[PDB]
Design an enzyme around this catalytic site. Structure first.
Site, PDB file in Angstrom:
ATOM      1  N   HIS A 114       0.805  -1.213   0.000  1.00 21.60           N
ATOM      2  CA  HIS A 114       0.000   0.000   0.000  1.00 21.60           C
ATOM      3  C   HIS A 114       0.844   1.272   0.000  1.00 21.60           C
ATOM      4  CE1 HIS A 114      -1.307   3.186   2.866  1.00 21.60           C
ATOM      5  NE2 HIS A 114      -2.324   3.280   2.028  1.00 21.60           N
ATOM      6  N   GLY A 151       0.148   6.033  11.436  1.00 20.23           N
ATOM      7  CA  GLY A 151       1.587   5.859  11.327  1.00 20.23           C
ATOM      8  C   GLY A 151       2.072   4.452  11.603  1.00 20.23           C
ATOM      9  N   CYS A 155       1.099   1.523  10.293  1.00 19.46           N
ATOM     10  CA  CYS A 155       1.119   0.598   9.172  1.00 19.46           C
ATOM     11  C   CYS A 155       2.508  -0.003   9.004  1.00 19.46           C
ATOM     12  CB  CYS A 155       0.701   1.338   7.904  1.00 19.46           C
ATOM     13  SG  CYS A 155      -0.247   0.341   6.782  1.00 19.46           S
TER      14      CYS A 155
END
Ligand SMILES: CC(C)=CC[C@@H](O)C1=CC(=O)c2c(O)ccc(O)c2C1=O
Lengths: 298, 298
Positions: free
Chosen positions: B40, B142, B144
């Protein structure tokens, strides 16, 4: 939902060593060229209770201490006592030494504990210094000497070193200068702590945490005065609310839009009516081991 | 004391890096000469409703991926896609890469999470893979790319990489081969977690822990076959108990002298009658994230 979290334990893990004297083994904290550990390591089983530590320490030499930093042994080149810790001086200085301080934390404050067994870390958890200067923690076989700590930026604030388990299953230890928390001594006699109480500042900070995560069910339109609330506080074995306590909760009340004494009225209701089986932040008990500073961080 | 404990985080901390691609930054895992992170990272808001990752990836070059391991910039020397992950190859090999595995945990099993925020570790907690393949975790903006893991001996078993939060507030992600846990996809989509069942293996272990700690008000003398219990459980959205689960409770049985099916007969009544009041280990809901293994550790 919202979790108790421990600081990343890595800066501490690299300071954990194994100290053995005679037949007794526990954990040590290797910072610079100095190893800290509980002085109880110089106690043979025959010495518990009737221990005179100055007597037992004069009869030992540097060679009677075997330090193992993982696999490598370190030469002990000096030794002295400070209160209930041993200061072992070693030839090599820990290259993994972090930036660090020694702090004596006050009751109510929280910290992370790195639980160790013979010098190797095993687990990490977060806990609070209870108002009776014990810690309801988890310390199993070979856990003696594990350290509690907080981290700010790059700097580790060591605040606790574990020593023993009280008859109640709660734990007793010192700061990193060897002074105990509370009324305890490192002798095999049975000792009681004072009657505990709930950390009111931390319950209120935790109520604010719920309001932040969209849990408002416990709020109400009422409000109390300081003394009015404190009389419900004493009735319920909660710490009285100091005038500066309100001032710590200041920024939290702003972020939520609930005046501190209004949150107290909510807590006052919560204590007198139970919770009717509902849950706050996910728990069915008024949680008292999160600080205001914890709540702002997480 | 009975607490949730997380593994010592340090062996993983020395692997956390900060992958940046465009205006979007997240966490990556640096083992040997390759770095893993959610694919992503190459999307943007304008390219996020139904992105085609193969098209997006072909349009990137090695120089599109800024990888920062603390102060040190590392230069991508290659890049491929593995399922919902990216494998970037880097110039330098991680001096701190520890003994490791990649592992796919079963629902019900627990693991530790190192919540990071733009390459910087922030906190450690323990949680469990749910039956619906989500995680009731703690992940702010933040986080991820933060990873979940267990430690056996000195080998780290990586088992989770965080990706998304679902509308329930719970979290979804992948193993370290990029395959998602459950049916989730890394598109923005009307997906939501399925109905979450309770981990009966872990509730039973919780009940044993309570018998070991003091309260046994919930024990009775009724008996139940495995089959007649599983039928009652499923009507209350509790996982059916397998025969392997019964063996896993062997140590906690015998130690308490209670017999597994008898602890099931107790749970059956807790399910069918509730607790009109009474507490268990302090709470009125049955914890289901403590494993049999966590209980035998104290
Ligand atoms: C259960 C008994 C009544 C109390 C034992 C106490 O004498 C003791 C035991 C111990 O194992 C220990 C350590 O392992 C490390 C430091 C340290 O102070 C201690 C101790 O004071």
């Amino acid at each position: 939902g919202f979790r108790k979290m421990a600081f990343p334990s890595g800066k501490v893990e690299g300071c954990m060593v194994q100290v053995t004297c005679g037949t007794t083994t526990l954990n040590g904290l290797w910072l610079d060229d100095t190893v800290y550990c509980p002085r109880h390591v110089i106690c043979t089983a025959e010495d518990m209770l009737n221990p005179n530590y100055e007597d037992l320490l004069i009869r030992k030499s540097n060679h009677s201490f075997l330090v193992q930093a993982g696999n490598v042994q370190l030469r002990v080149i000096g030794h002295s006592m400070q209160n209930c810790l041993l200061r072992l001086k070693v030839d090599t200085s820990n290259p993994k030494t972090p930036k660090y301080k020694f702090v004596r934390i006050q009751p109510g404050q929280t910290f992370s504990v790195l639980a160790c067994y013979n010098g190797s870390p095993s687990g990490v958890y977060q806990c609070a210094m209870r108002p009776n200067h014990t810690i309801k923690g988890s310390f199993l076989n070979g856990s003696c000497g594990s350290v509690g700590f907080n981290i700010d930026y790059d700097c580790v604030s060591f605040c606790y070193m574990h020593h023993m388990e009280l008859p109640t299953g709660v734990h007793a230890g010192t700061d990193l200068e060897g002074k105990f928390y509370g009324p305890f001594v490192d002798r095999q006699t049975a000792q009681a702590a004072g009657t505990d109480t709930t950390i009111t500042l931390n319950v209120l900070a935790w109520l604010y945490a719920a309001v932040i995560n969209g849990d408002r069910w416990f709020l109400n339109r009422f409000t109390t005065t300081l003394n009015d609330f404190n009389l419900v506080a004493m009735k319920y074995n909660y710490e009285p609310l100091t005038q500066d306590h309100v001032d710590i909760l200041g920024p939290l009340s702003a972020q939520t839009g609930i005046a501190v004494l209004d949150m107290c009225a909510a807590l006052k209701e919560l204590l007198q009516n139970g919770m009717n089986g509902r849950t706050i932040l996910g728990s069915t008990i008024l949680e008292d081991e999160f600080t205001p500073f914890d709540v702002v961080r997480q």
